[PDB]
Amino acid sequence: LIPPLINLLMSIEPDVIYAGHDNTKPDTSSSLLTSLNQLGERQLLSVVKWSKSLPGFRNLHIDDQITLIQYSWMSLMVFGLGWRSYKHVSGQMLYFAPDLILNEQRMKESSFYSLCLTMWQIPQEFVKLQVSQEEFLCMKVLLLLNTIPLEGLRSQTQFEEMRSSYIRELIKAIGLRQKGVVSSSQRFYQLTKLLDNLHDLVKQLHLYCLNTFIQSRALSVEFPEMMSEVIAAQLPKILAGMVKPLLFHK
Ligand SMILES: COC[C@]1(OC)CC[C@H]2[C@@H]3CCC4=CC(=O)CCC4=C3[C@@H](c3ccc(/C=N/O)cc3)C[C@@]21C
């Protein structure tokens, strides 16, 4: 059977979110970026709601909660994207939403082809490692907890306890399918290494995002209120390396 905390995590996963994109009109650079931002605003709102039901999280100081959402949002959404593309279209298309799915041909014509390719690494890797939903749900929580300020958080003790709690839960998640100490131990390394590597992938998306933000009026891309808030609140500090990424390995 499934360990209780893992079962809870599945019950609090967000519902399907639509882009609201008008697919009865040809893709333009403007229209895609507008749709992706509208969709992202909605996904981040659902991440915030999610976090209010995530055990441990509401007991961190409110300022730590805000900071962790502001540090981790891009990671959470690209990781979510990865999981949907894996589960719904065998990882061979980018499943942003049910009404916004890019096959490779549509990616090629997007104007951010290589960004699509960067993002496409995750679901291909999911296919490769055959990640289970139980492993995914634990890893996703660890991403939320994967960077802290250089001075630490106000609720550092509680945070350490929460992060350790979810690391122990991933170790239980691995034990469900994988049998053998050797196999389980190596799988713990693989999954935690994947999380480590996401720091580098996310940095590329952060730089693309901030560049597009700066040039938004010339490019005619709308940046929503919360999106603009999180960008202005932490993105340059993050890109500058003025935060502490938490690595599982050397
Ligand atoms: C071409 O991309 C434009 C982006 O750069 C503009 C660069 C990376 C995009 C995010 C990639 C992950 C992602 C997954 C989704 O399923 C939908 C949203 C999404 C991205 C987009 C995004 C928009 C808004 C928000 C939060 N708003 O509150 C989050 C993500 C756009 C960027 C950042």
Swiss-Prot record:
> Where do the record's region annotations for AF2 lie?
5-250
* Superkingdom to which the source organism belongs: Eukaryota
Which locations, inside or outside the cell, does it occupy? Nucleus; Cytoplasm
Q: List the disulfide bonds.
A: none
* Residues reported in the UniProt entry to bind progesterone: 84
What is the annotated tissue distribution of the protein whose record heads this document?
In reproductive tissues the expression of isoform A and isoform B varies as a consequence of developmental and hormonal status. Isoform A and isoform B are expressed in comparable levels in uterine glandular epithelium during the proliferative phase of the menstrual cycle. Expression of isoform B but not of isoform A persists in the glands during mid-secretory phase. In the stroma, isoform A is the predominant form throughout the cycle. Heterogeneous isoform expression between the glands of the endometrium basalis and functionalis is implying region-specific responses to hormonal stimuli.
Record PTM: Phosphorylated on multiple serine sites. Several of these sites are hormone-dependent.
| Similarity-based family | Belongs to the nuclear hormone receptor family. NR3 subfamily.
What is the protein named? Progesterone receptor
